[PDB]
Design a binder for this molecule. Sequence first.
Ligand SMILES: CC(=O)SCCNC(=O)CCNC(=O)[C@H](O)C(C)(C)COP(=O)(O)OP(=O)(O)OC[C@H]1O[C@@H](n2cnc3c(N)ncnc32)[C@H](O)[C@@H]1OP(=O)(O)O
Ligand SMILES: CC(=O)SCCNC(=O)CCNC(=O)[C@H](O)C(C)(C)COP(=O)(O)OP(=O)(O)OC[C@H]1O[C@@H](n2cnc3c(N)ncnc32)[C@H](O)[C@@H]1OP(=O)(O)O
Lengths: 137, 137
Amino acid sequence: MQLRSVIAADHPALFALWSRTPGIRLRAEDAYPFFLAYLQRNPGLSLLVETEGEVIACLMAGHDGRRGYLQHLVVDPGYRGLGLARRMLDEVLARLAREGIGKSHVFVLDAAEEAQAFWRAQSDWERRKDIQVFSTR
Amino acid sequence: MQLRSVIAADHPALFALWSRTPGIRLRAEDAYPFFLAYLQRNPGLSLLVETEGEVIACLMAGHDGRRGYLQHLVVDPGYRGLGLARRMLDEVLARLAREGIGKSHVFVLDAAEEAQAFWRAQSDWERRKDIQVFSTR
Ligand SMILES: CC(=O)SCCNC(=O)CCNC(=O)[C@H](O)C(C)(C)COP(=O)(O)OP(=O)(O)OC[C@H]1O[C@@H](n2cnc3c(N)ncnc32)[C@H](O)[C@@H]1OP(=O)(O)O
Ligand SMILES: CC(=O)SCCNC(=O)CCNC(=O)[C@H](O)C(C)(C)COP(=O)(O)OP(=O)(O)OC[C@H]1O[C@@H](n2cnc3c(N)ncnc32)[C@H](O)[C@@H]1OP(=O)(O)O
């Protein structure tokens, strides 16, 4: 079970993982050119776990020079409950802290009941009830 | 009324503007080293307006390779209602779009009644009622 940085050549394996994971919504930004630019901008910040040449978990992460933003946290069903998500999260947050990023955010759809439950259970995170988000249309 | 890119040398003027503007909360990340690293990561994406050698308006912006994030939108009280915030917004969004960033976010405190009113009035933005935000503690 090798934890390592995601690189551009991982795109087919990660896109396949995302595609087969209920609860992960694929969008335009998940396609190769966006992935390539993301990794060039955020090198070493996104992580995956592989075993026997297969990718079994991932966490995409990056920052804007002020805050961290994490996306597409996945552990394959066969490898859940082993602490892999927590392992990736601890490592991403450490790397972000090295780069001067002391606060990070995740966005979770209200309709994603299982994801909400996961994030409410992480004691190092808090659901924000003090802010509104406005986004471009 | 000259609109231009913010550079590192603008820190004293911008910090002074932020400091004298009710509704702008100053934090650690507003100090010079964070500002310097932010501008290196996001060159030309933050803007200011100056007239007669004085900075009268600003908008800080950046991105993580996936989404845009804007903050510290300010127009000096003597120059409000002249479209300066809209001018900066249009230009930042255009520059973000050139960089492949098609969706941007702002976080606005629930208690910030005037800022909420401003953002609700921008027809190119929408208040999100479909997501929860979790942040590191
Ligand atoms: C990425 C976003 O911003 S939202 C999208 C989140 N991802 C998904 O919804 C994809 C589908 N789900 C998954 O891939 C997995 O269920 C994950 C990644 C959420 C969790 O994977 P796991 O292997 O359970 O995580 P891990 O074992 O590291 O969990 C850390 C702790 O969180 C807690 N936890 C995990 N899942 C849940 C849950 N659904 N509800 C409450 N608490 C949970 C557990 O206490 C766990 O400790 P453990 O190791 O003793 O079980
Ligand atoms: C940065 C964030 O994410 S939140 C923090 C926002 N910033 C602040 O609260 C700092 C204090 N406030 C300010 O500096 C200013 O009042 C600003 C920047 C919010 C607005 O400055 P203004 O000079 O009004 O900007 P501008 O004229 O470009 O406003 C655009 C339009 O928004 C609307 N608008 C502006 N302020 C408000 C308001 N308080 N309520 C409702 N609508 C408004 C108007 O329709 C205005 O039309 P106009 O372009 O014809 O003038």
